[model samples]
Target chain A: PVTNICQAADKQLFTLVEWAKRIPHFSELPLDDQVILLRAGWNELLIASFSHRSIAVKDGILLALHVHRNSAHSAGVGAIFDRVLTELVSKMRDMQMDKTELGCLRAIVLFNPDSKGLSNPAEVEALREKVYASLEAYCKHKYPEQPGRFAKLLLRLPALRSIGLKCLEHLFFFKLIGDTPIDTFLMEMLEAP
Target chain B: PVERILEAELAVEPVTNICQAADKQLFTLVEWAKRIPHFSELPLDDQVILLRAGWNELLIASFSHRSIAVKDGILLATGLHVHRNSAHSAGVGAIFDRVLTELVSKMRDMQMDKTELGCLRAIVLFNPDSKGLSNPAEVEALREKVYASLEAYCKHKYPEQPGRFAKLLLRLPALRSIGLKCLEHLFFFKLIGDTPIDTFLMEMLE
Candidate 1:
């Protein structure tokens, strides 16, 4: 079981490398800058990619989860994480989010401009702005009927990370390595490509 | 050297040196103000306040504006090609004179020209941060447009090296570091000798 997850991590690495190159301007940035953004992201990027397949919400579900008397152990903390996942699905399917948007979501998480240790954060900043600019342009033009759909999708990102401990654990548990400082662990997978 | 003004030596746009170039730059900046679509249309009180607050940013950048491709020593109000000893001594003082002198090399390092510098000066004029205005939001919108133009112009001007536009903004504080109150003090004393200003021209320089 511990050994089985390494290929899963390896598979996602293939997916992430595939997506990073698709960013319109990503290949143009300096190589180390590409690495710096990668270091800031395994959890943020993974959660986003995972949810895009489901297509997402926030606040209301958070309030609905109040009955669980959250913030403590219940069902070994797994129950607390699962309800949030249901709300995430409930919101995405409600919006009927499309592939283009998920592409933007994956790219958004992948390119963290302010991520620590960048030699040229400004360049990264420009690319992120370009990403959002395109997202807004496409959303407004494509979904005028959906008016608030563009930003409503962004609201999902916070929840994507809100339960990232479980999300991170899910990855490690799949690996059978159990808990370790994910900040250190995420790097080799990021470094693998 | 000579700290004494002679009062005779001090005259507007006269060839004595630093003041001649800077005074012209300030005047040109005033004309530059006319080109902004909404500037003169704004509350009269707000327009003047923005000019007062932003002129120092405008003027330092104006110096940077004209000096691209030529580096080393003061460009001088004299506008000659090289540094000379008699001309170099303190028209404003070695400190600010040196501060003003450094930005030319900074932009020259970027190889930016008047087209880029002009937009920077216009954005400097639209400073929404300036205290007291009839409609602060209106001023902020005008500034936003010029920034949009500045970005487009640089990307078109140098596609491979688009880093130029970001420096224009980050260097606004660099110009400020050369001093806002300090730039105000340098020219206020140097130009007026504690007098005070307004042809709107003299008013701005004051």
Candidate 2:
């Protein structure tokens, strides 16, 4: 079954915005709402760690998701932002029902993945597998109705794969956000590689 | 003896502020004072004035000495208040002594004849062990050895400078003797001790 992009975007967008607002940039219908929309409507959880400019664009997507949800133009754009953020918590845990459904799990809590955390190079290789396994499990659980598609998406992202490869470069302590190399223990993880 | 005595006084005096004294008459005033061994034997007011002058010069000498000592990495630490393990005190004093000894020896060699050297020998008899070491027995023995080597080195390296080889002894208790023990104690007790499993841990009681 092919789920509607609008429905998927509506559900995921609101949840992401809700989580992003939990941190520093808390506002309604951000000025640059494209990236914010992605963050709020799609993988907002993943997009939160992006640079400031990237986050603003995703905020735009969040506004679009909000407008779709309420169908009420009279309500302020900020209302959409609020609704998206609030709606994500309940919808994020909802498994996508159709095979083409997207929006995989975007974050996890592992040991830091920076070089300081890894004592041996071999450890990073092991840690990368662990992170992958965790992501796989999360995607499967979060999108059980479309597990095949979620699993395929989980396995495909080049950026995600790069994280595992970077871990092989050095040891890291933890992976708090996407693209941040700081607490990531690549130094130790890379020793074995 | 007269010629030698006059010559040695000339050598040391010339290097000091006394060199700029206007005339023979002004220089004679200094000569007259040296002729009398004990200035304290003079009358009460004269003695008081002499004492006051001496105090003033001593104060200036020490003040200048401290400033110079600090500049050349000699004085490690100093103040009116207390400190522990004062490396500055130990480091500075050793450097001062070493440099002074070399300068004195060099001056002795700079004379036109051996008269100045002979005078220096006599002056040493009157005020030997210039550093006022608490344990003269040990310090004098060390000083003699140091002078002997210095003399030998001077003979070998005549006409050439000694290549800035002023030894910094960093004598352990020298600063403590001068009432700078607090810094020495602090260095051993606090800053060093705080480091994890280093020299401080081995030396400190706690």
Candidate 3:
């Protein structure tokens, strides 16, 4: 089970990195900014990508239905963790976020202007702006009757950040307490500088 | 009863001086909000909501502008008295307490300058999620302008620290988290009693 979970996590991380790389002009960013964004956005991307797999279990435990169920159950998480995941999962479900929207959100997170240590802040901002515009257009196209859909989707970004931070904290502790060797690729993505 | 408690707390200080400083801070926030480009163009109700929603974020940012420290888990802002025990007793939650601590610690680390502070306040003021915004696009556009200006300012001022802009912008999620927790507390308070939140403060939380 542990090996299976690790394999799943590795696959997810690789796909997220590949998705980000394929974003228009993503490779054009300075290498330092790209690393900074990847590091900053990795957790957010991971959470969003797996949001479809999250299921609210009894007592506020969000079971990632397909992957790492044993690891999450054994972690003994806190209220903040429960609240963040539950709310994110609820939002994901409520919005009926499709693959395209999730992909765009990952891009938005990757190209985030606030990712620490970007050498070319302006270029990063420009990339983020394009992603934001595209997301807005996509949302409008998908939900024409829902005028507030764009704002609602944009508002979820902050919640994702807050939850992603808490999730990272728990993952760090899990690695420590379990003495499990986290995959180097996953670790690099998580601790991207 | 709350007023009485507030008066008793004030008696511990030179009431007149503390009142003056508090009023000055409030007035400065109002003045700053008014000065944000396209802010005045927002509908009156939207303006109220934006100011109310962003009030605490601006307060924390402004408080950090002065040298404030967190000593022994207590926030120590210059010219402000934050009685940690009294705050907890008055029903402030641990989440807020933690948020303030983290925000102060980050502020201390960043040592943000006036331009950065002003840009942050503007960003908070132009939040698109503020309730009942008739024109969220306009608000978003204004926010974009402030973000651009901040990006330029950071590049010019902190050329050596390439990640400074990202670090500063990242602080907004913290502010949003704090605001949501406070709003939850306020809603709980409203359900139980006729707590009189001032119009400006009410608008911020709404």
Candidate 4:
């Protein structure tokens, strides 16, 4: 019956496999509905992965984040998505705590606030200074170990870069975030490398 | 947009780049080929031919049987059509059909023993009509033609089987299909490269 409905031309609602296939994190669903949930989640994952602003390039890091975030706490798929965002921002915050890490984190923040954990205007404003300070300290403490690793890692975050690049560089452009040029972070990153 | 140097062709260059970029997100090469404008546009039969030929190239390129097998499985599942065609048998059937057509033409140019040439022509003409020709005799006959063609072609291109060439070619479709699928899988390795098709293929195949 599932297969018949799956191939049925008249069916409109989602199937179990499709649902389960889309959102792997929603495995708590009844066996009958797992695939259907997966299908929906898979679609979202696809769009999120390929969207210009999403992180299509840093799949490795994104996957690592998924594994870590998923295993960290067992929650619903929607909750997992939210938690992933929170964890990503928390990681960004932790990275920002270090001057060198700030340059990279700022580059990621420049990509999008949604990329980080900040969504509201107040949060953006608060993190804006934090990012700026991180860039400044990173610039002052530039090293010669890892050239573009910091910025690249930040830009390569799973969801941020996809959103950033797909939007014609509008959202990710540092100019939109503030007057601070991305070159400042790049310069510091280069010096450190 | 930067000038498109590669235009929409599905050659080794695009395949290789996709493989490198895909990293962990591996899909079948044929499925990956679907993403490419060149392969996807062709009719199902032509798509198979191009894939088969591409597999040959990959064998020469990768030289690893295990890699070939993994890659082939991925490519076949990516919306690829594997139906039985009236014009040819399954598996190596298409390849034989093609080689026979070529051999008939070559017969005009080259002078060879009459018996050998006659035998080749006779084998080529025997077309098996069945729902799905999985007959042992059919496969063996087709393989014989394949070996003959390989002998003829290899005499000019290379002297020997070149180490892993046989195994690679044996599993050419598998390699190409899987490698292409891997390319489509953006998240096979991580989060960055996971595409919709990649995820779709995983769902369908797994």
Candidate 5:
């Protein structure tokens, strides 16, 4: 069901949020700053997590689902997103992303210094830098044999960045929510005690 | 390095904050329902049943609406929370929590506003579909009024998105799928496994 698809996306967001909670110093960011940063980078974080999750099963690289068989998008669908994610997922597989690497990558994306509306941009830069160093050191130690695995992973960010929010939410996860305006839904959750 | 990061994380753990956060969100949900127009019109028994049957779905939608921009992990917990016992990757909590967050993200993209959401909340609140509701025709009539306002609002404010009305309506049945049993270990299994969520909702719903 379309609802199940939405539920699937919801599950990933919870996992990402909980994972960020576990990250060191993430909570230390000003509450407003954390909110700003989370919204800024959530799309990248989710797409990355989907890739990470997809690569885990033994079948690993396959993403098969019959489109519009139920007739929602029976008119047609865009191919750009598929091409982007498939390539992105393949790159992740090539790098052999471990749990640690994925977590570090998630943090790096989340702490984007350039994200607009940031209250304390410098602090975000610091956190992003800290994650950067940690990721660099991680790659140096974990993939000493490969020598350039870290850069390879870092390069994938632009691919994710290139994706439009409309493409990600409206095309894919939006059907998960049906017609609820994402902004209103997000606002209610934020507005909640 | 992850080795360093992992050690630092292991050294400091904040465990039960989740349970308390959950308790707070439910409190918010109750206070939220109390604000609906015509809610107090029903008799005490009718009021009791509507809140009882409707809160689960409302709570899920509340969580759905909030996850995209949490103020903080604990202080900012939404209508959803993970149970302490189900924190592990192996548990159903992981699955449910993720879906809840994902729903928030999807809703965030839609950028729904206060008027739209207020109407949706009223629509869910006046659920004639709920069991044990007295004067359910009144309940049903109230539901129709809310949706009619919502449909007109969507049609007027957002002339471009034709599918909007049905989509918000779709969220109700969608909310039904995310019920208590699925949430057993996710939010309530250990925290209120003894007294349970209904006890809390009943007290708060009152």
Candidate 6:
């Protein structure tokens, strides 16, 4: 079971990296900035992907859990997990966010100019601008009746960042407890430096 | 002095009025950040770093303080109006126009109050994950305090709305998006002409 879960996690990581590369202008960034964006954005991208996965909810509690169960034992991580899950699930349902919107959001998260230690801040900002424009155009095309849909979609970004930060805390807690060593790929993505 | 100041303001363009309003909002955000508990306790450099990192988010959140509406690609705010044509003609990009409209629309939707806005600004400022912090732990603690305060405020003020806190937290990413778009705007504005951007405003964009 553990091996299978690890495999699943590995596949998810690979897919996220591959998906990011597929975004327009993502590859044009400096190699270091590319790595920084991926590392900084990993968890946000993961949550965006997992928003599609229908996990088992047995008896009003989450089931089919994977890694970071240790977080359930830590009060800080636990609070974050609960709040993040609640908000993410609620917003996803309310917005009926589609695959394209999720794709744009993942790009927006990936090209974060604020990602620490970026070498070419101007280059990263330029790429981020293109993605934002793409998202705006896509939203306009997709939701014509509701002109405000673009703004509504962008509004969900903070929840992603908040939840992504909480996931980092869970990873930190797991490391502190001296559980199994985190997967190398996952570790690199979580801790950029 | 009053007559001279009014005359000086009268010579500015309508677009300048909108920009001035945004500048005033930025000033208010700075004053608000100073009041967040434990914020002043950080080293001066760290305080500057946090302000630079969070200024845009706070700027977007300040929209709650003004009444803004977007109709037919025009922005209407308290004593200010900006048409899409004029902004585009002035070299402002479509992304910024859309972003501004969206932020104002979202703020209007939330109907956020002063206390909620204050808590949101604090949360944005104390982000632990910001790069190159001298003390990440201290920043995280401050962020937690603001989070707790916001949660308590939500429960007491909006008892009927169980998800109010979560909803408010969710607004951060949008604020981030607006911040980035604003950075792009500043970048293009510099490229276009000699607009003489303010030193403090430029630092916040960085």
Best of the candidates, TM-score = 5
DockQ of candidate model 5 = 0.01
Indicate whether candidate 3 or candidate 6 has the larger TM-score. 3
> Residue A28: error of model 1 in Å?
73
TM-score of 2: 0.17
- How do the residues B1-206 of candidate 5 rate in per-residue lDDT, one tens digit apiece? 12222232222211123334554545555556555666656665566566656656665555456454653121123334443232332235454555444455456667765566566666777878777666899998877877776787789889999998887676555556655444443343333332332232223222
Residue B21, model 5, lDDT: 51
Q: Per-residue lDDT tens digits of candidate 6, residues A20-104?
A: 7678887777666776676578768777666534233311223224434344544345666555456665566666778888788
Better of 3 and 5 by TM-score: 5
Which segments of candidate 2 are over 4 A away from where they belong? A1-117, A124-128, A150-157, A160-193, B1-206
Model 4 segments more than 4 A misplaced: A1-193, B1-134, B160-206
Model 1 docking grade: incorrect
Q: Least lDDT summed over 10 consecutive residues: which range in candidate 4 chain A?
A: A168-177
Query: By DockQ thresholds, what CAPRI class is model 5?
Result: incorrect
RMSD of 4: 22.7
- Each model's TM-score for chain A is 0.71, 0.26, 0.75, 0.23, 0.74, 0.74
**TM-score between candidate 6 and the true structure:** 0.40
Q: Quantify all predictions' global Cα lDDT against the true fold.
A: 0.57, 0.31, 0.60, 0.32, 0.58, 0.60
Model 6: CA > 4 A from native: A54-77, A172-193, B1-206
Candidate 6 lDDT score relative to the true structure = 0.60
List, residue by residue over A88-193, the lDDT tens digit for candidate 2. Answer: 3223224222222222133221112332323343443344355557556765776667656545544334333343333322211111112223112222222222
Write out the backbone clash pairs for model 1.
A55-A92, A56-A91, A56-A92
Instruction: Give the least accurate 10-residue stretch of model 2 chain B, judged by summed lDDT.
Output: B14-23
Tens-digit lDDT track of model 1 for A50-133:
554433233222220122213322324555345455646566667777888877876877777767768888888788788888
Per-residue lDDT of A7 in model 3: 46
Each prediction's TM-score against the native? 0.39, 0.17, 0.41, 0.20, 0.41, 0.40
Question: How would you class the docking of model 4?
Answer: incorrect
